[PDB]
Amino acid sequence: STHEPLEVLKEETVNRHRAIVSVMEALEAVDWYDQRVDASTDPELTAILAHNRDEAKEAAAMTLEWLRRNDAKWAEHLRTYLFTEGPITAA
Amino acid sequence: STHEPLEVLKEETVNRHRAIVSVMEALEAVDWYDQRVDASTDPELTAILAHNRDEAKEAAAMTLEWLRRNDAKWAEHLRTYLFTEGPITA
Amino acid sequence: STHEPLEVLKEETVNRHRAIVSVMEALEAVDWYDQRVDASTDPELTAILAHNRDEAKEAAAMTLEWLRRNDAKWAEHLRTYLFTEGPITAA
Amino acid sequence: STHEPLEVLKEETVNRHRAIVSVMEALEAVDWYDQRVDASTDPELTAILAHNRDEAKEAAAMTLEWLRRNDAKWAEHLRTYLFTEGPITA
Amino acid sequence: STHEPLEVLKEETVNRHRAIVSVMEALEAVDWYDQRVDASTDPELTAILAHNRDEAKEAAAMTLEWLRRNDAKWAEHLRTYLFTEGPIT
Amino acid sequence: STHEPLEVLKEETVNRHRAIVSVMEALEAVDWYDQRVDASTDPELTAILAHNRDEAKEAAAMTLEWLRRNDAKWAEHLRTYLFTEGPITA
Amino acid sequence: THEPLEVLKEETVNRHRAIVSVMEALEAVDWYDQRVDASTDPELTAILAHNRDEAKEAAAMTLEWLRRNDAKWAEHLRTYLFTEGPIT
Amino acid sequence: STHEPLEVLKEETVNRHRAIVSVMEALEAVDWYDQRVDASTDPELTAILAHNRDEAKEAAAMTLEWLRRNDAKWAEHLRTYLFTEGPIT
Amino acid sequence: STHEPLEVLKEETVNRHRAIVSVMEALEAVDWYDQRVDASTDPELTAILAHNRDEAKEAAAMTLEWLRRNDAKWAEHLRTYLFTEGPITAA
Amino acid sequence: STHEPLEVLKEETVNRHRAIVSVMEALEAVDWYDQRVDASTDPELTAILAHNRDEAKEAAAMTLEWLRRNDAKWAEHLRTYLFTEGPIT
Numbered sequence: 001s002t003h004e005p006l007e008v009l010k011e012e013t014v015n016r017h018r019a020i021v022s023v024m025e026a027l028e029a030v031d032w033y034d035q036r037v038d039a040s041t042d043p044e045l046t047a048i049l050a051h052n053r054d055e056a057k058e059a060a061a062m063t064l065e066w067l068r069r070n071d072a073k074w075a076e077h078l079r080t081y082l083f084t085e086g087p088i089t090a091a
Numbered sequence: 092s093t094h095e096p097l098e099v100l101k102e103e104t105v106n107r108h109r110a111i112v113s114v115m116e117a118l119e120a121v122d123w124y125d126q127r128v129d130a131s132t133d134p135e136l137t138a139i140l141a142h143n144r145d146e147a148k149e150a151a152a153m154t155l156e157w158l159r160r161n162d163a164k165w166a167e168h169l170r171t172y173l174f175t176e177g178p179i180t181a
Numbered sequence: 182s183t184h185e186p187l188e189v190l191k192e193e194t195v196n197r198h199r200a201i202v203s204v205m206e207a208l209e210a211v212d213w214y215d216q217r218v219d220a221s222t223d224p225e226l227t228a229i230l231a232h233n234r235d236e237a238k239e240a241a242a243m244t245l246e247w248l249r250r251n252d253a254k255w256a257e258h259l260r261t262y263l264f265t266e267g268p269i270t271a272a
Numbered sequence: 273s274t275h276e277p278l279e280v281l282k283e284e285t286v287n288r289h290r291a292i293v294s295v296m297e298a299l300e301a302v303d304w305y306d307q308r309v310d311a312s313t314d315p316e317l318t319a320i321l322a323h324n325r326d327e328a329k330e331a332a333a334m335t336l337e338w339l340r341r342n343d344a345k346w347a348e349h350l351r352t353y354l355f356t357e358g359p360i361t362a
Numbered sequence: 363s364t365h366e367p368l369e370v371l372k373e374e375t376v377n378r379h380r381a382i383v384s385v386m387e388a389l390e391a392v393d394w395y396d397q398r399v400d401a402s403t404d405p406e407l408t409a410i411l412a413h414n415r416d417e418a419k420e421a422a423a424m425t426l427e428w429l430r431r432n433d434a435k436w437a438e439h440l441r442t443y444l445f446t447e448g449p450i451t
Numbered sequence: 452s453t454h455e456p457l458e459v460l461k462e463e464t465v466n467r468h469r470a471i472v473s474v475m476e477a478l479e480a481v482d483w484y485d486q487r488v489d490a491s492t493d494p495e496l497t498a499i500l501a502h503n504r505d506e507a508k509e510a511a512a513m514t515l516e517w518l519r520r521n522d523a524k525w526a527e528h529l530r531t532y533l534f535t536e537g538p539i540t541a
Numbered sequence: 542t543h544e545p546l547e548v549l550k551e552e553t554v555n556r557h558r559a560i561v562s563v564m565e566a567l568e569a570v571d572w573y574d575q576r577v578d579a580s581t582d583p584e585l586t587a588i589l590a591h592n593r594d595e596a597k598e599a600a601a602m603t604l605e606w607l608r609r610n611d612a613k614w615a616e617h618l619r620t621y622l623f624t625e626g627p628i629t
Numbered sequence: 630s631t632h633e634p635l636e637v638l639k640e641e642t643v644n645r646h647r648a649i650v651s652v653m654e655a656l657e658a659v660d661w662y663d664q665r666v667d668a669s670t671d672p673e674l675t676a677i678l679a680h681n682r683d684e685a686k687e688a689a690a691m692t693l694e695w696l697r698r699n700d701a702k703w704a705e706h707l708r709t710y711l712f713t714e715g716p717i718t
Numbered sequence: 719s720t721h722e723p724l725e726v727l728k729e730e731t732v733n734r735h736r737a738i739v740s741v742m743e744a745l746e747a748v749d750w751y752d753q754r755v756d757a758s759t760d761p762e763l764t765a766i767l768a769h770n771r772d773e774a775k776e777a778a779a780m781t782l783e784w785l786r787r788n789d790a791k792w793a794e795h796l797r798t799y800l801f802t803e804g805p806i807t808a809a
Numbered sequence: 810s811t812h813e814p815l816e817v818l819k820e821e822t823v824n825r826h827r828a829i830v831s832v833m834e835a836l837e838a839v840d841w842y843d844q845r846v847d848a849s850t851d852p853e854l855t856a857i858l859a860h861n862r863d864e865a866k867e868a869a870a871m872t873l874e875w876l877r878r879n880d881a882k883w884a885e886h887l888r889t890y891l892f893t894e895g896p897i898t
């Protein structure tokens with residue numbers, strides 16, 4: 001699934017890759033479930049879709065914390081920006 | 092861009108969509124840049140690639156903070172897990 | 182996201198479409214998560230990936246039950262094969 | 273057809289992959305067949321598509337049972353939710 | 363799902379489009395199921411896959427018969443080649 | 452181009468794969484050529500496209516006869532439905 | 542298409558139909574020829590090679606249409622086709 | 630990037646592959662550039678896009694001549710249809 | 719061919735979109751042509767491919783100057799980095 | 810990520826490939842961000858997207874200069890067209 005061959009990649013690069021694409025897929029799941037939540041005309045499907053939407057938000061948060069713990073620059077930038085107030089582009 | 096038609100989606104949903112896919116695109120850029128840094132055999136090229144890799148992390152972090160501010164569940168789950176100690180799943 | 186234009190589709194069909202593709206995406210995440218579980222050389226990431234692997238299984242299951250309650254043939258074929266013994270083709 | 277290389281994947285993980293993508297492809301055919309059932313303006317084609325739609329639902333059902341027999345968590349979660357009454361998220 | 367817009371296409375063309383992509387999708391499933399039959403190391407799964415493989419051939423054949431009945435050239439060319447002997451060439 | 456690796460596939464499975472995808476690609480060209488015939492506003496182009504469309508039906512028909520000859524269930528299922536009368540779903 | 546139809550000229554849309562018909566024919570020639578090399582069944586190989594060459598013919602016809610209906614295709618095809626010596 | 634694996638392909642087949650897909654990629658750029666010429670509302674961009682549109686036409690033609698020189702059936706079929714008069718079919 | 723619907727885009731934006739993806743496609747032809755130049759074992763074909771590779775570079779160049787003339791930040795950032803000496807990151 | 814296999818590619822060709830695709834990916838980021846700048850109905854988000862849009866223009870510029878230093882024909886053609894006035898063609 002990696003774009004470069006595995007023998008030229010440091011083991012750590014490959015685990016960050018596995019974590020990053022797991023976040024990507026959770027995010028995409030959040031977006032698509034929410035869109036189906038707005039568009040659904042069956043209220044029982046909608047509760048299911050919204051529950052799993054929020055489970056996918058959780059999966060993303062866990063895996064982002066791993067990246068933060070395992071990457072110095074994710075650590076610095078996430079601290080710079082998450083849980084702040086005032087203009088985001090100026091933090 | 093969207094999966095469902097724009098006319099049945101709430102304004103807020105569509106703005107969050109724009110933020111989510113931007114984080115996705117920055118995440119993917121992080122991954123691909125970093126793999127290229129490992130594999131690059133030109134150190135001037137490697138330096139560019141590694142610099143822009145970290146600019147993409149910042150772009151991701153900015154947009155995720157936006158999601159955090161505009162979505163109750165993004166705020167709750169990011170607060171449960173980010174900047175913690177001990178087993179993440181716990 | 183539908184193949185045929187929305188105006189020629191019955192509302193129920195579009196609701197089942199939303200359900201089916203949601204199961205498809207959940208299945209896919211189960212598969213991709215589990216493969217990363219085998220391949221991860223970081224045990225912290227592996228635990229995160231396995232936890233979310235199994236939440237994706239739950240989302241699949243909830244949404245198939247919705248399909249079952251809202252489709253006569255899903256109800257029939259699921260009843261025939263799930264929770265059986267002996268050769269599956271022989272049920 | 274796998275994301276990770278075959279050599280680091282347990283044999284069962286690869287057979288479960290084969291089952292999951294087969295279920296995925298069956299589901300997609302159900303969906304597309306049903307949409308074409310609604311849209312076809314030739315009632316003969318419509319009968320074919322509806323018949324094969326349901327064969328495809330059956331193929332998904334068979335393979336899902338295989339998953340349930342070969343994965344403790346599929347078995348638990350399918351036991352929690354299928355053939356129940358009342359709110360699915362409860 | 364069509365390439366040209368629906369307002370400029372004849373209705374029969376659009377039904378034939380529905381039949382054709384149904385055949386393609388069944389064919390693709392035949393191929394992919396059969397490859398998994400070869401590669402599967404769990405024989406209970408292999409049996410499921412081979413049963414579904416062959417149900418997919420049946421869906422293709424039915425829908426190819428619909429095309430044959432609803433398209434003169436499908437009828438001509440399928441008549442020339444199917445169930446013949448000697449070099450297909 | 453095979454979903455599974457070549458070393459685990461039987462040679463005849465791989466040749467049927469080569470035949471099957473050739474039929475698919477010919478089928479696709481029938482559909483796309485026929486759609487362009489309906490939509491074209493140049494009658495010379497229209498005549499080219501309808502000519503090649505029907506050539507594509509021929510390549511499919513040829514390769515489907517090969518499949519019939521080389522796969523027991525293609526033979527059985529094709530012999531059940533082609534050149535029949537009355538409701539197909541029987 | 543790329544752009545929406547309402548901003549496109551009708552000459553451009555017909556050329557598009559011709560161009561992608563050539564592209565698809567070209568792609569079929571390639572994939573057929575690769576399967577000709579790879580096939581270990583000679584009756585299939587004969588079929589695949591036969592249809593390969595029909596696809597070259599479908600491409601050639603449609604290219605003549607582009608030539609007759611596009612001034613620069615007519616110019617560039619005339620410059621290079623059926624020549625000898627360095628193509629550059 | 631090839632359909633079949635490289636180890637079972639002739640180098641001739643693979644060089645013709647390189648030529649065919651290069652023509653395909655040029656053909657697409659001609660189409661997409663021309664569509665952008667129609668759609669552009671800036672006359673300078675439009676002028677750039679049209680020039681590069683026509684460079685792509687040239688690249689297809691050169692590479693198509695190589696195919697003619699290296700493939701007996703390319704040679705026969707191109708010589709039947711290019712630069713002719715009357716019904717192409 | 720736009721991610722967002724045309725009716726919400728500024729006309730100058732869609733034109734810049736048209737120029738950007740044209741650069742992208744020319745860049746891609748340069749890369750793929752060059753790889754075919756290295757790998758090709760026929761020099762007539764390699765010469766053809768090498769000629770068109772460089773024509774594609776020129777197409778990228780022309781189109782990027784249009785972007786430069788119609789977007790201040792393209793103009794600024796391109797003015798900082800192109801035709802410089804010494805470490806590219808430090809300009 | 811290459812179309813041809815790495816073993817037949819010169820080391821520098823692969824490096825230029827890495828640089829080219831990096832520019833390509835930046836370019837796409839500029840476009841999609843800018844379209845969302847126009848379309849967003851939340852001004853805080855728009856500010857983020859406009860900032861990141863312009864960071865991506867910068868990455869493209871950096872990486873484009875690297876190409877200019879490592880490819881004689883990029884150097885010639887970039888020399889010809891960038892920072893000029895008058896008809897580009």
Ligand SMILES: [Mg+2]
Nearest residue numbers: 055058059236
């Ligand atoms: Mg949870």
Ligand SMILES: [Mg+2]
Nearest residue numbers: 171172180181
């Ligand atoms: Mg906790």
Ligand SMILES: [Mg+2]
Nearest residue numbers: 197252255302
């Ligand atoms: Mg259903």
Ligand SMILES: [Mg+2]
Nearest residue numbers: 055236239240
């Ligand atoms: Mg749950």
Ligand SMILES: [Mg+2]
Nearest residue numbers: 326327330417
């Ligand atoms: Mg059955």
Ligand SMILES: [Mg+2]
Nearest residue numbers: 327417420421
């Ligand atoms: Mg049956």
Ligand SMILES: [Mg+2]
Nearest residue numbers: 506509510595
């Ligand atoms: Mg013929």
Ligand SMILES: [Mg+2]
Nearest residue numbers: 506595598599
């Ligand atoms: Mg012919």
Ligand SMILES: [Mg+2]
Nearest residue numbers: 683684687773
């Ligand atoms: Mg020229």
Ligand SMILES: [Mg+2]
Nearest residue numbers: 684772773776
């Ligand atoms: Mg030039």
